[PDB]
Curated annotation (Swiss-Prot), chain A:
Signal peptide: none annotated. This is Small ribosomal subunit protein eS7. It comes from the Eukaryota. GO terms for molecular function: structural constituent of ribosome.
Curated annotation (Swiss-Prot), chain B:
This is Small ribosomal subunit protein uS2. Required for the assembly and/or stability of the 40S ribosomal subunit. Required for the processing of the 20S rRNA-precursor to mature 18S rRNA in a late step of the maturation of 40S ribosomal subunits. Also functions as a cell surface receptor for laminin. Plays a role in cell adhesion to the basement membrane and in the consequent activation of signaling transduction pathways. May play a role in cell fate determination and tissue morphogenesis. The gene is rpsa. Acylated. Acylation may be a prerequisite for conversion of the monomeric 37 kDa laminin receptor precursor (37LRP) to the mature dimeric 67 kDa laminin receptor (67LR), and may provide a mechanism for membrane association. Cleaved by stromelysin-3 (ST3) at the cell surface. Cleavage by stromelysin-3 may be a mechanism to alter cell-extracellular matrix interactions. One of its GO terms (cellular component) is nucleus. This protein appears to have acquired a second function as a laminin receptor specifically in the vertebrate lineage. The keyword ATP-binding does not apply. GO terms for biological process: cytoplasmic translation; ribosomal small subunit assembly; rRNA processing; spleen development. Keywords: Acetylation, Cell membrane, Cytoplasm, Membrane, Nucleus, Receptor, Repeat, Ribonucleoprotein, Ribosomal protein. Residues 159-178 are annotated as: Laminin-binding. The chain holds residues 3 to 212 of 308 of the full protein. Signal peptide: none annotated. It comes from the Eukaryota.
Curated annotation (Swiss-Prot), chain C:
This is Small ribosomal subunit protein uS8. The lineage of its organism: Eukaryota, Metazoa, Chordata, Craniata, Vertebrata. GO terms for molecular function: structural constituent of ribosome. It comes from Danio rerio. Gene3D superfamilies: 3.30.1370.30, 3.30.1490.10. SUPFAM superfamilies: Ribosomal protein S8 (SSF56047).
Swiss-Prot record, chain D:
One of its GO terms (molecular function) is structural constituent of ribosome. Component of the 40S small ribosomal subunit. This is Small ribosomal subunit protein eS21. The gene is rps21. It is found in: Cytoplasm, Cytosol; Cytoplasm; Rough endoplasmic reticulum. Signal peptide: none annotated. Component of the small ribosomal subunit. The ribosome is a large ribonucleoprotein complex responsible for the synthesis of proteins in the cell. One of its GO terms (biological process) is cytoplasmic translation. Belongs to the eukaryotic ribosomal protein eS21 family. Pfam families: Ribosomal_S21e (PF01249). Keywords: Cytoplasm, Endoplasmic reticulum, Ribonucleoprotein, Ribosomal protein. One of its GO terms (cellular component) is cytosolic small ribosomal subunit.
RNA sequence: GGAUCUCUACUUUGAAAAAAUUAGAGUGUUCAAGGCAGGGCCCCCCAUUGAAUACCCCAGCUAGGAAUAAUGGAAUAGGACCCC
């Protein structure tokens, strides 16, 4: 469809506008059968370095892998409706708080590792650069407590994401609050 | 020397190839592996001539930093560099020990032949191990023409070159003598030096009479 | 086998420091090591370090500033109260003017001076001076 | 070292090794303080400026005295990379 | 080093960092599970099934194409053997040594190896009882073990 | 080797050292497309095949298990993939 | 006894505790060891005359912290929430 939120909440003008572009694209393209079974949860547009902005289209986790097969086509087509706006597709994963000794509860179900903050933040980093692939990951712990993550992407698919490394840093900083610099080693 | 005027020209690299300054024997020291370009098929290690030129000017900078030229000591124990260091000492103004270095020359103060320089320059670190070891008891730096199979036990400026070989060692003493004089107000650096590199070449007594 | 990976980390740093090295690679990475290297870095004993993150325990490459004399651990990891902390300072630290004893308290891994200000004790990891 | 009032009480501040930050002892006779002259940009002649480097006896005896001076020359833009 | 012998050799596999299936691998999760079921029925241990898929079908890691390991795929369907593969091969070796030891009576080397294998059987079975993989009444009997292999 | 850069080593050293003693461990193996001279179907074969690999629905043998890499049969061309 | 998840042992507080002894506050037995008394003003008054305080392992009790070290939770699921 267009958008199916979990709760009874309704999208705003921008999230509905992105949903309108998705249903309109499926009507007059080869993505008809693939976009009918898929939908999105939310779509938030943020700003990046300079006078540029990018949007973050959230997709449910069970529909993530099916969304990756057509992401290379959806990114090029959606960036034509919004020229100076990059698009990214990051799944909507929930982070469960770790079980402390103060929060009163009865039957918490062990908090699986997939819901940990470390696993979610690493999964977001992978889906943010889906056309490429993380080949290595460094953590530059500077002189102070502030660290810096250095992600090593594939040498291939570089001509596609060589300009989105600035948007990937702004998106990952907006969702997780971490500094990331991307490199392309050989 | 990292400038543009301190780069070796075509006539300098031709003399290194003619003498054999890049040939570095069959053995290799782990301290000299950064100065070797690539080992040949016959086990010979090729010494990088560009890195030799950088260590040569770095050696010439330390020599000019010595105010009194007499405070520089140029020791050569082997016959291959006896007359080379004598012409080097005369061209610059430094001291020299062309014969046999008497033990205790730098340490035994009451000895007659007692000389305390400010900068030691030896030909072969292995053949001149006694002047190097004795200079360690004092604060005497070291500039040595180090081959590939040459230990850097007490070497401060290792000049990678073919220390063994009459034409090879004589050219290095001639190259250093020119760069030390060029860094001073003696040579214009545009006209080639009048002194030929054949004046520093050790000649066997069989070839002198002919 | 490999027990007390923090000991193998500080032993590698202490050795590489005496050899005059500038960078030392630590094979097993741990949050206890990073919390230990951060306290050593906040006082100007080691430089920056990159946590090389493979899909395993991970490795660390630490820069050395030549200011460290010796870094070691206390293997039994005794429980240090706020009253017995003064006794550990005299035995381990070479002087009352410098050197630190990294403790593990409920407020986090920190040195002995910070444990006095926060008024809390715990277990002792090691020392560095 | 100070006397908590601005009084430097050390009778002499020794030289730290420019390669390993090691204190050069008063009886470290193998220690070396070598000076490297600076040349002019246009003519490459000696002007009067030089750079000082101190290497202790341990580093020098070990054999890492020439590599340390080489890295120290590249840092101060003395020899080419 | 080893557990019952000297030697500090490190000859093991080095898995890559990329936890993703390559682009040239078109076998989906369902296709891989069908291959495992066919190979598990004909009597192939999980170690042998992964070897065939790796060297003939290009499946570098079954854990990546699917969401579970090879043993969990068989345990879910119900094709996992009664006793684990590693414990089965230790008992298989002990029976072979003991059968050789009852014919050759004065080979003190084989008698020494039988103690080493049976020591590994008891410690491996002890780990399985803690994980509730084996019944608490399980016990390796040197006489009745030949009927289990 | 007193000040050696351990974070950015040259690829010649990483390729030379053991697969486990690298900065980040990586296998020395790969996958290849063995092409039988008679048939035309492409079959992905592991470098160290460790198993007698034959074409499915044919007779020709592709590889032979050895101590290290598999010894491919004569005429069986291959190419590695990444 | 490897690494890994928000970046009941340990630890801190309180309660409770025979004094004497020890540490220690006050106080010129002529000083001191000690004592617990005694000082100041012209029939009293002032210094609430004083006769403090600390320590009292471990265990038990209580209230915080959640790093470190153990430990449990959903896998032949009806497991957690609803539905009702």
């Amino acid at each position: 469809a267009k958008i199916v939120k979990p709760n009874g909440e309704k999208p705003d003008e921008f999230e509905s506008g992105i949903s309108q572009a998705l249903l309109e694209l499926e009507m007059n393209s080869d993505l008809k059968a693939q976009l009918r079974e898929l939908h999105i949860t939310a779509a938030k547009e943020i700003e990046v370095g300079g006078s540029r902005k990018a949007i973050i289209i959230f997709v449910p986790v069970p529909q993530l892998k099916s969304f990756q097969k057509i992401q290379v086509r959806l990114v090029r087509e959606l960036e034509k409706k919004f020229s100076g706006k990059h698009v990214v597709f990051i799944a909507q994963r929930r982070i469960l708080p770790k079980p402390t000794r103060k929060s009163r509860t009865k039957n918490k179900q062990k908090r699986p590792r997939s819901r940990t903050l470390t696993n979610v933040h690493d999964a977001i980093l992978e889906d943010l650069v889906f056309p490429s692939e993380i080949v290595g990951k460094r953590i530059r712990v500077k002189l102070d407590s502030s660290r810096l993550i250095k992600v090593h992407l594939d040498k291939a698919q570089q001509n596609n994401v060589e300009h989105k490394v600035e948007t990937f840093a702004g998106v990952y900083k907006k969702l997780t609050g971490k500094d990331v610099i991307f490199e392309f080693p050989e | 020397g990292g400038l543009d005027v301190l780069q070796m020209k075509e006539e300098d690299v031709l003399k290194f190839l003619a003498a054999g300054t890049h040939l570095g024997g069959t053995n290799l020291d782990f301290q000299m592996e950064q100065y070797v370009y690539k080992r040949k098929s016959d086990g010979v290690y090729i010494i990088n001539l560009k890195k030799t030129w950088e260590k040569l000017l770095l050696a010439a900078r330390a020599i000019v930093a010595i105010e009194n030229p007499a405070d520089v000591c140029v020791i050569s124990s082997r016959n291959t560099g006896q007359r080379a260091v004598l012409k080097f000492a005369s061209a610059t103004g430094s001291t020299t020990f062309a014969g046999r270095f008497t033990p205790g020359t730098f340490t035994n103060q009451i000895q007659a032949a007692f000389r305390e320089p400010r900068l030691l320059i030896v030909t072969d670190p292995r053949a001149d191990h006694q002047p190097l070891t004795e200079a360690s008891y004092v604060n005497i730096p070291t500039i040595a023409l180090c081959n590939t199979d040459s230990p850097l036990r007490y070497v401060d400026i290792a000049i990678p070159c073919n220390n063994k070989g009459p034409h090879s060692v004589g050219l290095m003493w001639w190259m250093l003598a020119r760069e030390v004089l060029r860094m001073r107000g003696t040579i214009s650096r545009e006209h080639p030096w009048e002194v030929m590199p054949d004046l520093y070449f050790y000649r066997d007594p069989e070839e002198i009479e002919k | 086998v490999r027990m007390n990976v923090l000991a193998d980390a500080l032993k590698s740093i202490n050795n590489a420091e005496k050899r005059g090295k500038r960078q030392v690679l630590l094979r097993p990475c741990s949050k206890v090591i990073v919390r230990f290297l951060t306290v050593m870095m906040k006082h100007g004993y080691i430089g920056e370090f990159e946590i090389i993150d493979d899909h395993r325990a991970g490795k660390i490459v630490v820069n050395l500033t030549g200011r460290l004399n010796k870094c070691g651990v206390i293997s039994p990891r005794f429980d240090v109260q706020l009253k017995d902390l003064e006794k550990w300072q005299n035995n381990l630290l070479p002087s009352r003017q410098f050197g630190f004893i990294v403790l593990t308290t409920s407020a986090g891994i920190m040195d002995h001076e910070e444990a006095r200000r926060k008024h809390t004790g715990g277990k002792i990891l090691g020392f560095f001076f | 070292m100070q006397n908590d009032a601005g009084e430097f009480v050390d009778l002499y501040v020794p030289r730290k090794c420019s390669a390993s930050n090691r204190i050069i002892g008063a009886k470290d006779h193998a220690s070396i303080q070598i000076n490297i002259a600076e040349v002019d940009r246009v003519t490459g002649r000696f002007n009067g400026q030089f750079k000082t480097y101190a290497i202790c006896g341990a580093i020098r005896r070990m054999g890492e005295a020439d590599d340390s001076l080489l890295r120290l020359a590249k840092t101060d833009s003395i020899v080419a990379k | 080093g080893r557990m019952h012998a000297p030697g500090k050799g490190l000859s093991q596999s080095a898995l890559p960092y990329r936890r993703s299936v390559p682009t040239w691998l078109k076998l989906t999760s369902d296709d891989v599970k069908e291959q495992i079921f066919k190979l598990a029925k004909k009597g192939l241990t999980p170690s042998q099934i992964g070897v065939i898929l790796r060297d003939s079908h290009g499946v570098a890691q079954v854990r990546f194409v699917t969401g579970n390991k090879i043993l969990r795929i068989l345990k879910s369907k119900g094709l996992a053997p009664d006793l684990p593969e590693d414990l089965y091969h230790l008992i298989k070796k002990a029976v072979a040594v003991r059968k050789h030891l009852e014919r050759n009576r004065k080979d003190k080397d084989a008698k020494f190896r039988l103690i080493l294998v049976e020591s590994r059987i008891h410690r491996l079975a002890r780990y399985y009882k803690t994980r509730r993989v084996l019944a608490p009444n399980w016990k390796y009997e040197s006489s009745t073990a030949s009927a289990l292999v | 080797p007193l000040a050696k850069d351990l974070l950015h080593p040259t690829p010649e050293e990483e390729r030379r050292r053991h697969k486990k003693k690298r900065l980040v461990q990586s296998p020395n193996s790969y996958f290849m497309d063995v092409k039988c001279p008679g048939c035309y179907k492409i079959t992905t074969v592991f470098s160290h095949a460790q198993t007698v690999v034959l074409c499915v629905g044919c007779s020709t043998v592709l590889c032979q298990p050895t101590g290290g890499k598999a010894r491919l049969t004569e005429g069986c061309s291959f190419r590695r993939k990444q």
